[PDB]
């Protein structure tokens, strides 16, 4: 199997697949939130589910969707850099804590925005799980520019 | 050639690369959209096309941009699921499958979301297109933790 | 190193992690102007730096979050695009060419954006930058489709 590429590879895969399905859980709730709060982005949703007045925002709607976003934001760069990372022969262990902490991290940060836990609770998850990708993006820069 | 790899991978690159030019012409369409009605985000864009009463939303324009999001929350983890897939070894005519019912399913959700199409038609054609996406995600989750 | 598998890879990788670098940036960015102008987007931010009123938009705000956006929209596509592309032997030079247009491109966005510099130029480097995106895309469509 091309799993076995590079020994990094397998703990990538898992982390990162992890990662897509909490981002398809974050769905499932905001998906659960606008159904239950009767809160449509689309006025043909609003009357199929009980009239035009729930074509509105909401609150918690909206706290779901700023989850997703920054989802999209800190997640999909790891994918990128975390696949290439993988194939830059770094130490297995090192490695292996670079994508335990960024999925540690972001796991708490979603819990942390849709569990509405105090300031700079997730703040702080957003900053720690960022502190891997940085040092990733950083040694992927070094290796390209030594290959030029 | 590279895309002689794994046989699933021409398929998938196939489906990926349309997919993306679709995303570009959501973008497209965005941009024509905010033209014609004149609904800018940046007061220089409505300044220079009209006036400043022209920086203002618009619910063609924020219908474009919840379509072209979307895209972003669900094609760009294909991107990843489909390659890494792809490379897995599955059964060539089952990962054309996959491939294309996610293919079908997300232009059908744009023409349904742009369109304004009546519900649950929009719905529907994301919950299909995400069934291939899940399918791929549990079979990267086991080949990974399965090398670990 | 597995970053001499195909000769516009080295050039591609640089490329890319720059970009990935450039969105932290505006995240960063974003984080600054938030702070400073006192514009949170959750109660628990606000309250945390000054009260309930602090929960508020900002127009400094949506426009980073705008070009934050904008960035999704087009360096996620060439993360993938210009990852493959790089493994079908283009030409070198006609790749770097490819890679340092959307680089130079997507920077003058970011300045253009976040500067408020007079219409069309912002517009003028988006559409730059999605010319060597249209470009990759068109290869790969061919490449694909004729490995089928
Ligand atoms: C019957 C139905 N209704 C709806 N949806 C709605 O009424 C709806 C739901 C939401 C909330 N979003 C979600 O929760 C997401 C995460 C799914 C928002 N707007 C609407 C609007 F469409 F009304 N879907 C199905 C469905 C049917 C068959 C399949 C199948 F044949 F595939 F089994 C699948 C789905
Ligand atoms: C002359 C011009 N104007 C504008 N744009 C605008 O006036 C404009 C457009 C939109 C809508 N967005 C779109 O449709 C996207 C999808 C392109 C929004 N805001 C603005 C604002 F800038 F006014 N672009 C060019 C252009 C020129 C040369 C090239 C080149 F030299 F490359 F050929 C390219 C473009
Ligand atoms: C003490 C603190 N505060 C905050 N954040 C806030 O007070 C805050 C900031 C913003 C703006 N966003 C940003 O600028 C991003 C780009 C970081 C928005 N909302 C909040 C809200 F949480 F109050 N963070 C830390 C921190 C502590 C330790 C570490 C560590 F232990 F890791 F060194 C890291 C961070
Ligand atoms: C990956 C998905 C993780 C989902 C995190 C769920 C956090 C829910 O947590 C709950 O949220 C409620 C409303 O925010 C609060 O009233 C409760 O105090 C809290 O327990
Ligand atoms: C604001 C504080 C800066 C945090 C940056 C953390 C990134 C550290 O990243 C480290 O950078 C080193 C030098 O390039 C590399 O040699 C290491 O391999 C890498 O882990
Ligand atoms: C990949 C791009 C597909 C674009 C889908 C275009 C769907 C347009 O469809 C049209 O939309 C109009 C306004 O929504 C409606 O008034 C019309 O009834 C409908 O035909
Ligand atoms: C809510 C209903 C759940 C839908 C989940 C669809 C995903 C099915 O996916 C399947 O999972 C199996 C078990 O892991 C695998 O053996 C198959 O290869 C895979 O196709
Ligand atoms: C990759 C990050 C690039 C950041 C671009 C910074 C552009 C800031 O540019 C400044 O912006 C101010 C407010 O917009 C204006 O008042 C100033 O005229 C302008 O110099
Ligand atoms: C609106 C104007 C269209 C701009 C499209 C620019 C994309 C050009 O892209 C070119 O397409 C050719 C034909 O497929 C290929 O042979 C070239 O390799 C490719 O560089
Ligand atoms: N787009 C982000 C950029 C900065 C960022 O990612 N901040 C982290 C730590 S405060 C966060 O959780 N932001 C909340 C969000 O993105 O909604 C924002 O507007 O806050
Ligand atoms: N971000 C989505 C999460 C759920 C989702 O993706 N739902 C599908 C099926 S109802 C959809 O088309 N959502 C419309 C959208 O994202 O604007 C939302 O707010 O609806
Ligand atoms: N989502 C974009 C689609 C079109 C686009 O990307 N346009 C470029 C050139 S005008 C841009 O910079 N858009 C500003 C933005 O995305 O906020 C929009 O609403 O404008």
């Known amino acids: 199997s091309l799993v076995m590429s590079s020994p ?4 990538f895969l898992l982390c990162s697949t992890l990662l ?24 043909e949703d609003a009357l199929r589910h009980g009239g035009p007045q729930y ?6 709607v909206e706290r779901c969707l700023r989850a997703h976003r920054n989802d999209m934001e800190t997640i ?8 290439v990372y993988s194939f ?3 130490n297995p262990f090192v490695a292996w804590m670079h994508f335990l902490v960024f ?13 509405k836990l ?23 820069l070094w290796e390209a520019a030594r290959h030029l």
């Open 88 to 90: 830059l022969g770094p």
């Open 20 to 43: 897509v399905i909490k981002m398809y859980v974050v769905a499932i709730i905001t998906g659960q939130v606008r159904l239950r709060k009767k809160a449509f982005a689309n006025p």
């Open 118 to 140: 105090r300031a700079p609770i997730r703040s702080v998850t957003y900053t720690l799980a960022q502190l891997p990708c940085a040092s990733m993006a950083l040694q992927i």
């Open 8 to 11: 990094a590879l397998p703990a």
């Open 76 to 83: 999909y760069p790891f994918l990128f850099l975390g696949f």
């Open 103 to 115: 999925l540690v991290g972001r796991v708490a940060h979603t819990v942390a925005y849709l569990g």
């Open 55 to 60: 074509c509105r925002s909401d609150p918690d």
